Enzyme design. Structure first.
Site, short mmCIF file in Angstrom:
data_model
loop_
_atom_site.label_atom_id
_atom_site.label_comp_id
_atom_site.label_asym_id
_atom_site.label_seq_id
_atom_site.Cartn_x
_atom_site.Cartn_y
_atom_site.Cartn_z
N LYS A 23 -5.28 1.23 15.92
CA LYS A 23 -4.73 2.18 14.97
C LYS A 23 -5.62 2.21 13.72
CE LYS A 23 -0.78 2.33 11.91
NZ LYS A 23 0.60 1.76 11.75
N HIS B 239 -9.00 5.17 10.18
CA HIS B 239 -9.90 4.89 9.05
C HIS B 239 -11.37 4.91 9.34
CE1 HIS B 239 -6.43 4.09 6.61
NE2 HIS B 239 -6.03 3.16 7.43
N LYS C 288 0.62 13.07 6.56
CA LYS C 288 0.39 11.79 5.87
C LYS C 288 -0.17 12.11 4.50
CE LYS C 288 -1.78 7.28 6.43
NZ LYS C 288 -2.99 6.47 6.75
N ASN D 29 -5.18 9.32 2.81
CA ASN D 29 -5.88 8.52 3.78
C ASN D 29 -7.30 8.34 3.34
OD1 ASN D 29 -5.72 7.16 6.36
ND2 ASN D 29 -7.19 8.63 7.09
N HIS E 28 -5.15 -2.98 8.33
CA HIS E 28 -4.59 -2.17 7.27
C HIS E 28 -5.65 -1.93 6.23
CE1 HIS E 28 -1.81 -1.30 3.92
NE2 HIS E 28 -2.48 -2.27 3.26
N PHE E 29 -5.71 -0.71 5.71
CA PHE E 29 -6.59 -0.34 4.59
C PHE E 29 -5.76 -0.43 3.31
CE2 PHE E 29 -10.61 1.50 3.25
CZ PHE E 29 -10.29 1.88 1.97
N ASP E 30 -6.07 -1.33 2.40
CA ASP E 30 -5.27 -1.55 1.22
C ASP E 30 -5.70 -0.71 0.03
OD1 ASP E 30 -2.90 -3.10 0.50
OD2 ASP E 30 -4.16 -4.01 -1.01
#
Length: 124
Positions: free
Chosen positions: A7, A12, A41, A44, A119-121
């Site tokens: 994902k 990303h 969304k 992003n 995860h992209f923080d």
């Protein structure tokens, strides 16, 4: 089902281009990556680097995530990124985005074995 690591790649990664090349980049990518299927969304980020270089961030500078978790990592180098942000005219299913190109450090959360980004923080 799709793994968290997969994902992250779908949401990303864009190693196929070095930077966004037009104002339409985000509109096309958000759609093509299935990020607008159920809802628009709102924000992003896409990273224009090799997957190996992004995965390597999990061995770089450990930092707190925005929510306080301690499995976040900041890249030592800046990376080419594109920020996508919903515009005022966006309306599902015709989701619309502003494209902004930047060169920033990335912060990702890592999990698993192999220890990879999930995860992209933030970018900083």
């Amino acid at each position: 089902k799709e793994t968290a690591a997969a994902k992250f790649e779908r949401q990303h990664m864009d190693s196929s281009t070095s930077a966004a090349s037009s104002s339409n980049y985000c509109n096309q990518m958000m759609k093509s990556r299935n990020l607008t299927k159920d809802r628009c969304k709102p924000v992003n980020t896409f990273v224009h680097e090799s997957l190996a270089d992004v995965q390597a961030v999990c061995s770089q500078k450990n930092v707190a995530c925005k929510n306080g978790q301690t499995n976040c990592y900041q890249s030592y180098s800046t990376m080419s990124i594109t920020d996508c942000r919903e515009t005022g005219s966006s309306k599902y299913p015709n989701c619309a985005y502003k494209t902004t190109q930047a060169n920033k450090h990335i912060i990702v959360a890592c999990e698993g074995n192999p220890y990879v980004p999930v995860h992209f923080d933030a970018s900083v």
